[PDB]
Design a binder for this molecule. Structure first.
Ligand code: SF4
Ligand code: SF4
Ligand code: FCO
Ligand code: F3S
Ligand code: MG
Ligand code: NI
Lengths: 544, 262
């Protein structure tokens, strides 16, 4: 069984490291299990306030800076938002280019997340020193494609490098790691530790290439600069040579996804099968991504190839349509002013009011987004369940591939283990569609180079921009008055997932998901980290 | 077993783009940097320790016998006694001030730490400040939103092995920030001939005409973008888009509206 202490009392983990931004987690523990939780975001910046009175054309440049990890996505969301407010339909080439940069972002983001943010909760790096590299190469030759990076020679050079580093006395980023001296919550054999660490170091180099791919279309990374109202500016991005380079780089990235990421993900999952019963939630939302028709929010919702939808109480037999009128934000338990509850984002209000640390009545800089009173989990798992339930052929194949490979039922995906595997799943599917997408724009480009449509700024309008960012459902909501920004509101995936309670005192997805967490060691509560990281938290995103 | 110099990296009011920019380095790659050149002793984005374990690691690096260098990412929110930006239950200003006190040197990575950046834009609800303003201490500024990894790693390596590079009036190393974006722009002959794109959909835009009439802040921005490119492949103006002036102090208010000059 899962290691579990008898500890009864509070645990606070602040900072939660290996996320974007500043999060404090508070839990009550009773006999070694979490009985209650609070997700407390610890920084406020106020981009919504800052945007007021500005040129709607500028929004995307400000909102991009909501987050530099999920770079681009907010520029995209704002461009869609303003495109909608001015009623412009972007050219097909602009639709394709925008969607491909999103694809490149998914690949970059998910890779960095698994290896450099998440993996250290499951992998004991210093145990890797106890591995015999010849045995590791042998274990690797079994559970994973043949590759020279998994040779004994390669694996012993990693081991050697890490040995010199550890014996230096300067542990750097591994200083005080929860795994030093062993830890009953860490299950991997030393050999798997060595494989996973070798891949961790390779991933550091491959993420560079994934960002280079993105920069071909996006101008630079982080913080792209190629989107304009009415479309894109990057006419070079439609030509033969840049697109060939982009393909080449993407294929290198995708090879690494299929040779390292998936096999590792699957190995880890295989040893942590008990985590298929920890960290489940019930409701899922997606706005869909990769649409063939981005002429309107309605068309995006309907034509996303990663489909949109709403799942409630794990009912895979009934995926509803997204009602964008049915979204609102509560602030009852957030550091904002009285009178702000139940606001649709078009009527959004952002009036910050701090009280005190660990005030059980007001404990977060995140608002609480709700869908008809329901907290909704967003992100890769949501997309996966929704696509699965709709019978999207790629997800159906891959999910059942993973189910059969781990020998578990579909229902073990309602978990931290599932949340983690889903991220890998969707990376594999993006990878499988890159060449198709690239060839479609190359062809489209070759024929005609319309990239930007003409448009007029209205005196008064409203618009919404939808995207399924790497972390989940994202929306930007604008009100234009006197040709300026009257209200601009972000509702962001992390807001959905890691926000505080809503007006009825109902726990958010991470808060619910934490309930029932076993704690082997309250001094070193790695288990809290496993679940929180599975959500891939971004606090700068969530609070903006 | 040669001792590597200690680097403490703090995150305050930031979007983590500078951390992301930093790890795009290729000369050397980040792993070679942290395994061979420096001892990266605190870095919240990637460090294994969490919570009290993490906070201890910081207090270990700060108390290290050989001293440390300070890298700061993000601005400092100062309203309500710094309480709108907190880590481990302390205001960021408090912790940054603590860390600055004993630092061998302070490098501000990004426009946020250097000058205040995006959260300081009007009407500045969190009363955000850049570091040197919040702390009253000289910083080496590596601005940009985010800066090129070449500029950051170049600065770091230069400080560890040569000394403090020559800075301009805004604390930026002249090695990377000595020249206007505009002076190195492949579109400069179009600018000189008054061949301007009037819009993004125009034939002129398609023909790669100068983006000045669409707000390009190249002629007033100091950065090395077109000489060194980003990710070894591109830069904004090459991707058809005007420069935002993102390396200039308070650019969010001085370079806006971004699609204008006025
Ligand atoms: S300078 Fe820019 S990229 Fe860097 S932390 Fe600040 S807003 Fe983000
Ligand atoms: S104004 Fe901008 S596009 Fe035009 S020559 Fe200068 S940097 Fe190049
Ligand atoms: N992905 C991503 Fe960032 C978050 N949360 C956004 O939007
Ligand atoms: S916007 Fe910034 S990245 Fe360079 S091209 Fe202009 S200074
Ligand atoms: Mg918001
Ligand atoms: Ni983000």
């Amino acid at each position: 069984p899962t290691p579990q202490s008898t500890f009864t009392g509070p645990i606070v983990v602040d900072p939660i490291t290996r996320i974007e931004g500043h999060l404090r987690i508070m839990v009550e523990v009773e006999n070694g299990k979490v009985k209650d939780a609070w997700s407390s975001s610890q920084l406020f910046r106020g981009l919504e306030i800052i945007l007021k009175g500005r040129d709607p054309r500028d929004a995307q440049h400000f909102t991009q800076r909501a987050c530099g990890m999920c770079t681009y996505v907010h520029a995209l969301a704002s461009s869609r938002c303003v495109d909608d407010a001015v009623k412009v339909s972007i050219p097909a080439n602009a639709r394709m280019m925008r969607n491909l940069v999103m694809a490149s972002q998914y690949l970059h983001d998910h890779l960095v997340h698994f290896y450099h943010l998440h993996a250290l909760d499951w992998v004991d790096v210093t145990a890797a020193l106890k591995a015999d590299p010849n045995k590791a190469a042998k274990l690797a030759a079994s559970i994973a494609p043949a590759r020279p990076g998994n040779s004994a020679k390669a694996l012993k050079a990693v081991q050697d490098k890490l040995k010199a580093f550890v014996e230096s006395g300067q542990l750097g980023i591994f200083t005080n790691a929860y795994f030093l001296g062993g830890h009953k919550a860490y299950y991997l054999p030393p050999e798997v530790d060595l494989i996973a660490t070798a891949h961790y170091l390779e991933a550091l180099h491959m993420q560079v290439k994934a960002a280079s791919a993105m920069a071909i279309l996006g101008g630079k990374n982080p913080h792209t600069q190629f989107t304009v109202v009415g479309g894109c500016s990057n006419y070079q991005g439609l030509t033969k040579d840049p697109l060939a380079n982009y393909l080449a780089l993407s294929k290198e990235v995708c090879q690494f996804v299929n040779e390292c990421y998936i096999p590792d993900l699957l190995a880890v999952a295989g040893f942590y099968k008990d985590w298929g019963g920890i960290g489940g939630t019930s409701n899922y939302l997606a706005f869909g991504e990769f649409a063939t028709d981005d002429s309107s929010p309605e068309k995006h919702l309907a034509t996303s190839q990663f489909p949109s939808g709403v799942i409630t109480g794990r009912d895979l037999g009934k995926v509803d349509n997204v009602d964008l009128g049915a979204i609102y934000e509560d602030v009852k338990y957030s550091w904002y002013a009285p009178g702000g509850d139940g606001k649709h984002p078009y009527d959004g209000v952002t009036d910050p009011k701090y009280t005190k640390l660990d005030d059980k009545d007001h404990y977060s800089w995140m608002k609480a987004p709700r869908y008809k009173g329901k907290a909704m989990e967003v992100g890769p798992l949501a997309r996966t369940f929704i696509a699965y339930a709709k019978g999207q052929p790629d997800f159906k194949k891959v999910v059942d591939m993973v189910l059969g490979k781990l020998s578990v039922p579909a229902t073990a995906l309602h978990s931290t283990l599932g949340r983690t595997a889903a991220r890998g799943i969707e990376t594999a599917i993006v990878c499988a569609n890159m060449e198709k997408w690239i060839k479609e724009m190359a062809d489209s480009g070759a024929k005609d180079n319309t990239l930007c449509a003409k448009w007029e700024m209205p005196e008064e309008s409203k618009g919404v921009g939808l995207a399924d960012a790497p972390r989940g459902a994202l929306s930007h909501w604008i009100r234009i008055k006197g040709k300026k920004i009257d209200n601009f509101q972000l509702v962001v995936p992390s807001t959905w997932n890691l926000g505080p309670r809503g007006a009825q005192g109902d726990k958010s997805p991470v808060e619910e998901a934490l309930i029932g967490t076993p704690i082997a060691d309250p001094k070193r509560p790695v288990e809290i980290l496993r679940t929180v990281h599975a959500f891939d938290p971004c606090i700068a995103c969530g609070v903006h | 077993a040669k001792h590597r110099p200690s680097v403490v990296w703090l995150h305050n009011a930031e979007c983590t783009g500078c951390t992301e920019a930093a790890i795009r380095t290729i000369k050397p790659y980040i792993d070679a940097l942290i395994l061979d050149t420096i001892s990266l002793d605190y870095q919240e984005t990637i460090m294994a320790a969490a919570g009290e374990a993490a906070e201890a690691a910081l207090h270990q690096a700060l108390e290290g016998k050989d001293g440390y260098y300070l890298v700061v990412e993000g601005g400092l929110p100062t309203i309500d006694g710094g309480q709108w930006g907190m880590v481990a239950g302390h205001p960021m200003i408090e912790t940054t001030k603590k860390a600055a006190a004993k630092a061998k040197g302070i490098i501000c990575i990004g426009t946020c730490s250097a000058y205040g950046g995006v959260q300081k834009a009007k009407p500045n609800p969190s009363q955000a400040k850049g570091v040197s303003e919040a702390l009253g201490v000289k910083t080496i500024n590596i601005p940009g939103c985010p800066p090129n990894p070449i500029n950051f790693v170049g600065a770091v390596v230069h400080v560890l092995t040569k000394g403090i590079p020559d800075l301009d009036e805004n604390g930026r190393p002249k090695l990377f920030y000595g020249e206007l974006v505009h002076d190195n722009c492949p579109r400069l002959p179009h600018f000189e001939a008054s061949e301007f794109a009037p819009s993004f959909d125009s034939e002129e835009a398609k023909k790669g005409f100068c983006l000045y009439e669409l707000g390009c802040k190249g002629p007033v921005t100091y950065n090395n973008c077109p000489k060194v490119l980003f990710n070894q492949v591109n830069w904004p103006v090459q991707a058809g888009h005007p420069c935002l002036g993102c390396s200039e102090p308070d650019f969010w208010d001085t370079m806006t509206p971004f699609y204008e000059q006025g």
